[PDB]
Homo-oligomer: 391 residues x 4
Amino acid sequence: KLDTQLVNAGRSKKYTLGAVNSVIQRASSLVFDSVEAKKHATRNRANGELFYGRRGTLTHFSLQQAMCELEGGAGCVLFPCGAAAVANSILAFIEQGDHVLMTNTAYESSQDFCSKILSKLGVTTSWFDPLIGADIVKHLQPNTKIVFLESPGSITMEVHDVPAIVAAVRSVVPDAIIMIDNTWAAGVLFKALDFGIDVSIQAATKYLVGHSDAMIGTAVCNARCWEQLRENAYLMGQMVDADTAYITSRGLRTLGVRLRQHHESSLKVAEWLAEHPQVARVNHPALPGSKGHEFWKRDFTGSSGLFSFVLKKKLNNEELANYLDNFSLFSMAYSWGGYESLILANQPEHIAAIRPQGEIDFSGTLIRLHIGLEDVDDLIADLDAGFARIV
Amino acid sequence: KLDTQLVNAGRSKKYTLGAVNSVIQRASSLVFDSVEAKKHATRNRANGELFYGRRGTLTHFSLQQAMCELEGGAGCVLFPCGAAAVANSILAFIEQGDHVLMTNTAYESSQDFCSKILSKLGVTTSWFDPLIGADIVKHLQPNTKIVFLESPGSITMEVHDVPAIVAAVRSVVPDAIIMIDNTWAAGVLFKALDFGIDVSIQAATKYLVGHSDAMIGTAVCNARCWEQLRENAYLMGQMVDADTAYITSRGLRTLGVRLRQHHESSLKVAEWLAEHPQVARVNHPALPGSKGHEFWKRDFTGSSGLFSFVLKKKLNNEELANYLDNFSLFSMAYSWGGYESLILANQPEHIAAIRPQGEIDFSGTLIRLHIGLEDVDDLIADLDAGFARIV
Amino acid sequence: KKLDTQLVNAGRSKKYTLGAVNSVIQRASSLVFDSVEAKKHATRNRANGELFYGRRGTLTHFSLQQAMCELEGGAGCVLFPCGAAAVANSILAFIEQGDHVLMTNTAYESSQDFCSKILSKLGVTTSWFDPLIGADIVKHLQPNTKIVFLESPGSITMEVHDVPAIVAAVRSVVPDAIIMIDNTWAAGVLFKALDFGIDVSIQAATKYLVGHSDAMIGTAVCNARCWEQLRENAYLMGQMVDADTAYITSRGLRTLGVRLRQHHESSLKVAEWLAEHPQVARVNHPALPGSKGHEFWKRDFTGSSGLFSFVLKKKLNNEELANYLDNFSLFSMAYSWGGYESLILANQPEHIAAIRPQGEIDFSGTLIRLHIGLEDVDDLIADLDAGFARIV
Amino acid sequence: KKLDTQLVNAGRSKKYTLGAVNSVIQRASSLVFDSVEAKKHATRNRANGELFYGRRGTLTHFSLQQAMCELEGGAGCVLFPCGAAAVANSILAFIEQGDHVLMTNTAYESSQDFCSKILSKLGVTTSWFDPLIGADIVKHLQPNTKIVFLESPGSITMEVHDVPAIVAAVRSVVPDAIIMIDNTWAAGVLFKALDFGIDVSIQAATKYLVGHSDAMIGTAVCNARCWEQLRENAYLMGQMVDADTAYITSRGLRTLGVRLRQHHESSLKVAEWLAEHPQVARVNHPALPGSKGHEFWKRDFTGSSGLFSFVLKKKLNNEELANYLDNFSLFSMAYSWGGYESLILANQPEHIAAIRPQGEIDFSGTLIRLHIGLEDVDDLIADLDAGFARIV
């Protein structure tokens, strides 16, 4: 049923108004036809009636309903990008004197927000190894307010044991807000809310948009946490533009066909890399032997196309340029979840800089690949010519 | 020269690329053609080179340059709406233990952010009368970090004596960040940065967009404050979409012709209202006798079209509906700065609720009008039929 | 009925705005029918503003159409992907093999080229008339004349027709002619074409209606007589415009009054200064006394836009042309006009003679066409004066 | 040269992407010339991908054009505001009074109506041929035949032409005919029309290329022989598409492979189930053995899309039609197709007979046209089965 759900999510007649897709209603001012109507809108301003463009128009309401259907949420809060969704969802639940506990494989800008912004506000952050499972209880404090997960991890791809973590957290600090950056799974390949997580956050920028051309963050909330996240992010003025909301809704339509290709291609590339003379290790959650692969197999319903691998060699600057500068099909850029395949290098000392209170376990240059929609054998051919440049 | 500046601001060839207007470059991923190029982009990521869509594309850079030219700034920071610009510009400069001092006529969501969000983060806020001038020194504390102005004030339209306030603040707390919500002036009718203000904030949603169909906040900074505001708002993921940046740039083009009509019409309406049997008081900065009109005349180069007036009567609910429900040309909606004229009522007890540490001085129903681009005599006719419904 | 109030409200019915101030943007090809009964009703009303199929329009197009009918006083508004398509397709909609088309020799060049290169091979002939022919247009009418095509002011040279004289004269000889006008310069609104007994008023909405040089679109506002035939025959040619452009055209209407008043005030001040300037031979501005057809403009228009031309005393050689045009600071060279910025183009007398069929030109200096935008008028005059000093 | 890699990269030259992954969106009418020399160079290259005037395109259009030339193997790509405009205007670009047009009687109805209602009054005649005529097309050729217009598979009834036989036969009699095909169903890519000696491959990019039912646009990819004439004559009619739609069409290309593979796999599974169903008389799916021209599809196409039809054993009366169509849960009624969602439409045999000129129909039950979208195929089959139970 995921394919049927994606096609239809949010496409109620009150939003589509005779069209297949939702209307695009651009607005700040929304007009009240009478004092009575304005009183009704005001009462329902956070309940999907037209009130003011900062709260949404019909376009936003459509995306919101779609995201709640897909991720099994009580509400969906919108932001101008994923980093805004992370920073503001955390902010929405903290106060001076709180502790935040975050996986050390969190997205770097997520870590930065905590280390550079929260620290000045009387909020301390500490870190954990993504494979800690039930042993996370050692890191919990009486003042732990947020436990922030990201599975798989940024760059290095470690999958958490979310069931174990959640049961441990609920046993010790049941008031904690458990959040996950669920971007890799595009919210649909891991049903975070069904595992007891309070908030599922995505850079909708990535697979939901699908084409590398719009930025948008989403936070789907359970009933417990929706009101606080919604109202407190509203107080920070968080919203996304109507057109971007429309394009996000539109990305959902092809999300199933895209994610099946990303899975099929990326796993075939991971398998080929794993057997290559020049590769030390492959980090792909769907690949047997990868860190937390067992948790991927048990808890996810698919894979996307982002993964990494580690070269046997630590490339020097000359070698790095010869490798990365001469790809035919892979491009160097940040982000991912688009239709085109991307490549970035990360030296071991770079990654060690962004694993606080943890330790690196590789020594070669780490390559992160986003496997897009191009013919997989063409991509493999491009990677092999790559290896020949650095043998 | 303002008209020539508006027409040309930001329209460098590197952004327009053969067209009259800037290109619309939609992107998250921005591609690096080599390792050397990526190192160059990285070094210049906050200096107008293409790096990642969260920092901007050519479209954003164009708007940024335009806003810096118009408002005489070192940099322009972008946000998803005005309320986001206010909340995040304040957040960018505070830490636990700070004091914020804000005019009691600040926009209500500005006050709310301080009372509901900052309070939990160890930051206290207090308030001042907008006409306080040099006497503001009584409100300054050793830990005052931000002095937040809004001139004219929201709803009630009081104009500050900005020179007096700034000299007083610099004499007592020279480290304070002085910010102003300069939306009414559309940043161009009051050159805030030239008066020693550190940050000029706008709901670009209002007159810069001009058509009530896009939401966007801007903060133009002096050289002292730009880096901190830019980097700290980036850490909160603040940005606006490319298309909205384009539409903002595009609004600037007609801003002079619009604002001259808004001034001409709104002042003629204010003059007519001032002489009407049913009106107690008119609050329009351009109208002699209005609170701080002298400061308007000395410090501004024009007026926009938003003002208010107070009825002799405090309308009951029946009367409120008869009045507001039967307008032909005025519409009820929030926001303003568009092409169409708007009307809202505010009872005295409502306004008293949002003037902290201050006192109301009127007793009749307050009407706020946005005077748009319609024939002024048609608007006056609509207001007079209005008066006849409540005599 | 005051233009400014009309511009602000035109098309913004609740059924199209749906709670916002502007019309919604409804992007669609497919439009869904909830039942066979609904499908049947939509089919009947497919040319009557019911949702049927995106080629016929969505709510966004219907909004613009209503606005254009209101503003120009028409029974309907047909939409096209640019102004040239509106012209070409509006003429095509009414002709058949064996017809003749009578067109002002001041017509936009692409309109002339459509007649001479397309219509000719379809058995349709074209001839041309001087824009100041007036009542004497009777001399050019044939038994097979189907269309009389006006453009006032003229392209480039700005001659204003005596429309009342032309129209009364055509109707006295060929009452059932389709009279059309390319009314782009007046933005449909400074000259109410349909009130003068013209059947079809065509614009390049590309120009003033959009107002920012960033969208292309053509409109044809038609009387009740001609609406069905234009609409249906244009539809058979697949003519439509995208919903987003329709929205931006509706949105342009909102500032069209404040923009046109600035373009008039500035362009007339420029024109008056140019008339006095010793390097200028003549100024062609409808609003400036002495211009061809000024007295007709005075009588028949309720305002001016910002496009006009002037003729230099010199015929510039190539080196002087370059030195003049290449070094402007505020004026830019580009085609189109009707935007917020000022443009400049040169035309040599021999270039204009080549697009003035069956007629002669009336100047021998280099002609400069100006679009006066929204910049400070004294800055623009300073840029023009610096230009003069480069070709003394 | 693998389709998937081509789709991802087509048109994304650095000069159009300017640092991003997708082409920039350059909205413009005016395009600025920095000097007289630049203006002169832009003028020369105005049909060669230099910025000249928005009616000719911006960088965004040039990107799409390059992508379409690459994908269909053409020398150029002409753009139009919808598919119907592409058809109408591509035919117009090549005809003149006295010509004859030979068109498949399975042609999209609007294409037939253009010929019968527009072309007829311009001295151009049209006749029609059965889509399975093959080599016997020679029987319909006249000395004045200028165009032979193919559509394969056929609209609604889905008959596949033997294109190699038709084309060899036309060239043996009228070598200088312009042969065109409406190649919308194959999305330009499952049938490489230009490799079969067809001159012009036309699509309603509206359908599969856009892929989301929210933009309208037509394309005509032309060989070197025919490109200039199509381009220039289409331009004289003002044909263009907006930059934003061009961008969304380029963007549609990126997922066209993954979408078409799902539409094929799902629609064939549906077709196979329908063939077996006791309330179904026949299935018209190019990929299903037994369908008209299947063996030609097998030989000539590299895949299928998701549009096909089937004929019920019953001719539904009006009450049964309603009960059937009105109560679907996943299929929607709407025109167009090629999007992500599934659509259903009914056509009675007498309705199809009326749009099958110079030929007869081959069925007597109600015909149902299906577009199979991206929904779960077993959900769609369950909705169809519930439909069958409503008309047993």
